[PDB]
Design goal:
The PDB classes it as photosynthesis. The entry lists the keywords beta sheet, Electron transport, Magnesium, Reaction center. The structure is a homotrimer of 357-residue chains. Helices cover 17% and strands 50% of the residues of chain A. Chain A contains seven helices and 20 strands. The first copy, chain A, has a 16-stranded mixed sheet that branches. In chain A, strands 14-15-20-17 form a four-stranded antiparallel sheet, with no helix packed on it. Chains in contact: A-B, A-C, B-C. Chains A and B meet through helix 1 and helix 7 of A and helix 2, helix 3 and helix 4 of B. The structure holds bacteriochlorophyll A (9 copies). The site of one bacteriochlorophyll A (BCL) has 22 residues of chain B, from strand 1, strand 2, strand 12 and strand 13.
């Protein structure tokens, strides 16, 4: 029988939206990857840089093995809000695949805009979900052309841009490789044609550098969390100490195994009336994973454990928890099991938890 | 276990395409709504107004409660065919959400056009399904700007239209909220950019009125019933007395419960050769519901009852009925059960019923 | 219970990428066709014409019965590669539906272009799958206007082209009938507006002929095999004798039954290191069938038999085979059964088989 075994745990901090999240999962069904096996490890870290100007330093490392090819991507960036709609970033990183690698540095800004703002909606809807909007990226990137492969790609690109009028359109076929293209529509997401503002070869300290300045916008009909939850997804103001997440998966023709461990702020939020809630589930991950969650029938063997800070209690949970031991609450079987099956297949049915002192 | 229990009943009138439809359904699986609970009641009524000019008066009321917010929409309209391709309407209604509400009045015409008409298809295909075409809307609407929220929205819009060249394009991200966007492609449906022909503030008897005149077209590759079955979906010529439908659902994290009761013309149609059929199932509802029907495994406990007028008998049914008692025919289990599972998940496999005297 | 019973067999030739493929399948679940019943037979044949210029002659016959309407399409074409990116074709055929039929002749070229070519990818990825690109069609077609239906359609079209500026856009709604439209996005595929280069009525030996010259391009994000595997899908260089495939299905409200039998080159390919593999599974068929494979729950009763040439053995298989008798290997149950369920529902998880002497 195909069985998914999972275990999730959330330990909340008092007052502080911080939480520790742990997850383990294993399913004996094949992944929908046309190249197997595929293993990946991810490590994310962020630390307060300069709280006066709202800067944080984020670092990410992705490492994987796909059909015997070793890949790696690292990125380090400094990010800050300038206004409520405009955020800026500056960073550098590296990509490496087998014997090949290249570096890059960049600076960019993103402006997030909602299509409407209405007090009539605001005062009448206590927990608004869909927020339609558009987000603008303005990027400057630099890559040292220090090997023949880079030179070839740079020259090929400069040739294409200057010869093909549809380049700004067709580039999207290249960018959203494989089923990434398909996922755009699934999430109510649109990518505009790009605008190329400048392409130059500079003379760097150590050699020629390919410099490019370009922009694009991305629209969302309300499920794109990047747009609808712009402020909430970057809780820089609550980052009083370093946060981190380590996650990884191993997969082949027999099954998938995953592990996650992290601690960061933003896990709980003020729900008003003196109540707090675990944050609303982001929609994108459920909709995108929904594209791969329907290929094998499975049974669910799942459990969730929520540990509240001392003296806090759950005022409302639906689905309902099965047991409680002081501050620890557990869910398993029954309606919780049906909800897990549901979300693993792509459903976004609400699972709400409100707690208070 | 997840079980869907449903009961459907159709009682046909003799000769007259009229029928009474009753449906009850309950499933213990969560709905895919990111806000729960969600309850809704709908009431539709239509009555012959002036049969000489083909006018009917339709009225609709929608009432719901979503996460504790009460919403309501009413609409009343007079509709008539002018030609076989052009239909006109004039009406008014109201929207209300919590402490907020606004009214509106409108007049509009819709022109439905098929991309081709061929006698070679017509004489060779007895029961044609896909009909590709395009439909044009021309709308004039008026809303009294009688509160600050309306004024804010009106001024914001007039500002956007005059400052953003992409407004006619991006408005579509706002219009098709959440997963409504996604459903467009799923049904082979396209919405053009809008055309804004006029935006004015008039001086009404009781205050300023925001007046707008705009158009859009919508294409369909053949599954869009609004286009392919343009004439059949508005049987004004068979409406010799008032028709109505009452329907509603209650839903939360535990399950969904639905009830429908109606009586209206258009349930049966001439199939030629002296035969009649229950109308072909519209495709849109199956394809759209198919987007939410695949998140939980279920067992089917379903029954269908068809009551023919006295002296009529079923000449062909596939799937086959299980039993017959005079004019009453029943379906349950076996192939019918597999067909129900199929359509609830998004399939459009044909279920045909032909009857005759 | 819904059960799918299938049997697949591959017999490989030694050295030669030739293989014989046999498949039988039956499932008692209804097809997603809004018109039933639907039966179809297909016959394909190809033979070396002139190996010096790389020409092959291909012939196809499609015959079906849909809801009692008999349809038939035949096509015969001569095809050759001119370069590695450009292929040319010349042919003729016929379409017939009930009492109607028409012929056609044509000549066209297709140019396939990849968006990038990189040695860094080539040397580091041993078995590349996604290849983004665009394909250009240039078509000249001729149809004798020998009946009133043809004349009507021709005149209607010439009228539309000259009156509607959006014809080159809207024609796509007509072309991708029903759910064919939807399938485009699902496979990461895009069709451009068409370009009409010429529309003329010529005076043929036997009467007026409608002549048209038009083009279109089609983009693919990497799953479109027509683009990413352009060379491999037309193994003209391995066609040393005639190849053929016969296939057909019967279907109605009770189930689907299918049979396939063929022999052709391209079934196995050099995998490097002295190893050979069965070719990578094309992605389109799995993704498109995935749109209809999820409407009924089923159990799998499936078996695969692979017969290698004398003296060859399997060096790697995942999922693993169950048994081996000399050169014959069999798969059934366990991980193979889960893989079948997976691909029948739309998954593309890799099933790899490497063999060698
Ligand atoms: C049988 C039903 C099964 C099931 C079947 C499958 C199948 C089948 C698959 C998965 C896959 C996965 N499943 Mg599942 N899965 C089940 C239940 C679970 C459970 C659980 C029970 O709790 C968990 C935790 C998981 C977890 C996972 C992940 C390990 C994995 C998806 C990886 C991912 O996020 O990539 C997200 C990837 C991306 C975002 C990459 C995008 C790249 C493109 C080009 C886009 C660029 C983005 C943008 C430009 C970059 C942003 C720029 C800004 C700077 C940010 N599944 C159920 C029970 N699962 C998939 C997988 O990969 O397995 C190895 C997969 O194929
Ligand atoms: C450039 C990227 C953006 C950004 C984009 C997003 C987006 C987009 C989302 C979040 C979400 C969240 N972010 Mg943010 N976020 C950024 C910086 C931060 C910082 C910080 C101070 O720098 C913090 C503390 C957080 C914290 C948070 C939480 C409030 C929330 C996740 C809650 C949860 O329970 O997850 C539980 C944690 C897990 C289940 C494990 C996740 C572990 C894996 C390793 C990470 C995901 C990998 C992703 C699928 C693959 C990346 C592919 C790209 C090609 C690289 N973000 C930067 C500025 N963030 C999510 C949310 O809910 O928003 C409201 C969300 O949708
Ligand atoms: C959507 C968003 C959102 C939302 C944001 C950006 C921002 C950025 N985007 Mg965008 C799509 C694109 C593409 C593309 C070609 O598809 C590009 C090139 C960019 C480029 C960029 C940069 C200009 C900028 C900084 C990214 C960064 O630092 O990555 C760092 C890379 C990572 C951290 C890798 C993983 C990120 C994932 C999505 C985070 C998941 C959070 C997880 C659930 C919880 C995290 C807890 C941790 C302890 C932090 N985006 N894009 C951000 C910005 O600063 O604007 C100026 C921003 O806020
Ligand atoms: C486990 C599998 C389950 C299942 C799982 C689900 C799930 C999961 C969900 C449903 C949902 C629903 N299911 Mg189901 N369901 C099952 C079987 C059934 C059976 C049955 C057995 O007979 C029935 C009768 C139902 C009935 C229903 C409905 C009560 C409900 C869809 C509401 C709707 O139509 O909104 C249609 C809504 C719209 C058309 C709104 C569109 C708004 C957008 C912005 C578009 C504008 C349109 C346009 C501009 C206006 C027109 C202008 C012209 C003037 C006309 N289901 C199977 C057995 N069902 C959904 C729901 O809402 O539940 C509460 C849902 O999430
Ligand atoms: C402005 C809207 C259009 C219109 C648009 C449509 C569309 C679109 C369709 C129909 C369909 C039908 N219409 Mg019509 N229809 C109109 C006016 C009428 C009038 C009349 C004289 O005024 C009559 C008698 C009918 C009668 C009929 C039937 C012939 C047929 C439904 C058969 C059935 O078995 O349903 C069985 C009944 C049910 C299963 C219960 C339905 C109950 C719920 C309350 C109604 C649906 C709500 C919808 C999902 C949500 C609306 C969301 C919008 C945002 C408001 N229509 C007006 C002019 N009609 C359908 C059909 O089959 O076409 C051939 C269809 O697809
Ligand atoms: C598709 C169609 C179709 C099809 C039609 C329209 C028509 C109209 N459309 Mg359109 C999309 C849009 C949008 C939008 C912004 O998305 C707008 C603003 C409009 C606007 C309008 C009006 C100009 C006009 C009258 C609507 C009306 O009276 O509603 C009244 C609202 C309701 C009745 C609510 C529920 C309607 C549902 C879809 C009916 C389901 C029928 C049910 C299955 C069986 C009914 C039996 C009853 C006893 C009647 N459409 N659109 C119609 C017209 O008159 O053209 C001039 C028309 O025929
Ligand atoms: C319950 C789950 C079931 C299941 C449920 C279904 C359902 C439901 C359906 C099918 C359908 C089919 N299934 Mg299945 N199926 C199952 C398992 C199987 C197994 C097996 C176990 O091995 C097999 C062999 C099959 C085989 C098949 C086929 C007989 C059939 C798809 C026909 C096709 O290819 O049309 C491909 C068709 C096209 C490509 C036509 C495209 C026309 C459009 C307009 C596009 C034009 C293309 C282009 C312009 C022309 C090219 C130009 C160049 C010159 C080339 N299924 C699983 C177990 N199957 C479907 C069917 O048709 O059944 C009769 C269907 O509805
Ligand atoms: C105009 C069409 C193109 C073409 C387009 C494609 C496409 C597209 C694909 C192939 C694929 C393959 N082609 Mg090629 N192919 C052409 C000419 C040929 C010639 C030849 C010398 O003329 C040969 C020998 C082949 C041989 C091959 C194999 C290498 C490979 C199938 C392997 C397999 O196991 O299938 C197993 C066989 C079966 C499972 C049975 C199939 C039987 C049915 C009758 C055929 C499919 C019908 C299709 C679904 C419906 C057609 C609808 C259209 C509207 C007409 N092609 C011409 C030039 N070929 C596939 C592949 O894997 O590419 C790498 C693939 O995706
Ligand atoms: C994608 C491709 C690909 C890929 C190719 C074409 C080629 C052609 N395309 Mg295109 C889409 C379109 C549409 C459209 C309106 O949608 C049109 C009109 C065309 C028109 C054409 C012609 C100019 C040309 C020759 C087709 C032919 O001979 O058919 C013959 C028809 C058939 C053989 C019917 C079935 C074809 C299926 C897809 C083959 C499946 C193979 C099966 C899996 C294994 C086969 C083994 C056998 C023993 C052969 N394409 N298109 C080809 C060409 O020659 O370019 C110059 C080419 O290589």
């Amino acid at each position: 029988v195909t069985t998914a075994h999972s275990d999730y745990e959330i330990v909340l901090e008092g007052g502080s939206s911080w939480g520790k999240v742990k997850a383990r999962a294993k399913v004996n069904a094949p992944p929908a990857s046309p190249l197997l096996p595929a293993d990946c490890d991810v490590k994310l870290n962020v630390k307060p840089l300069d709280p006066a100007k709202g800067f944080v330093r984020i670092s990410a490392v992705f490492e994987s093995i796909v059909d015997s090819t070793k890949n790696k991507l690292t990125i380090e960036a400094d990010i800050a809000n300038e206004t409520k709609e405009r955020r800026i970033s500056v960073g550098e990183g590296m990509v490496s695949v087998g014997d090949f690698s290249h570096t890059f540095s960049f600076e960019g800004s993103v402006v997030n805009l909602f299509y409407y703002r209405s007090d009539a909606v605001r005062r009448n809807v206590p927990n608004p979900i869909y927020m339609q909007g558009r987000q603008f990226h303005d990027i400057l990137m630099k890559v040292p052309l220090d090997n023949n492969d880079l030179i070839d790609t740079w020259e090929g690109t400069v040739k294409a841009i200057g010869s093909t009028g549809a380049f700004n359109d067709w580039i999207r076929d290249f960018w959203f490789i494989g089923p990434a293209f398909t996922a755009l529509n699934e999430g109510g997401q649109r990518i505009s044609r790009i605008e190329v503002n400048g392409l130059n070869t500079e003379s760097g300290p150590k050699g020629p550098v390919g410099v490019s300045r370009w922009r694009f916008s991305h629209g969302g009909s309300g499920m794109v969390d990047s747009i609808s939850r712009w402020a909430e997804l970057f809780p820089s103001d609550k980052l009083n100490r370093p946060a981190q997440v380590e996650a990884g998966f191993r997969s082949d023709s027999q099954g998938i195994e995953v592990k996650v461990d992290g601690e960061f702020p933003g896990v709980s939020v003020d729900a008003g009336g003196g109540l707090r809630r675990i944050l609303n589930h982001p929609l994108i991950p459920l909709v995108h994973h929904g594209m791969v969650g329907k290929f094998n029938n499975f049974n669910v063997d799942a459990q969730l454990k929520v540990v509240l800070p001392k003296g806090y209690k759950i005022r409302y949970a639906a689905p309902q928890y099965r047991s409680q031991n002081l501050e620890e609450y557990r869910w398993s079987g029954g309606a919780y099991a049906r909800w897990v099956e549901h979300v693993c297949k792509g459903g976004v049915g609400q699972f709400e938890i409100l707690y208070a002192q």
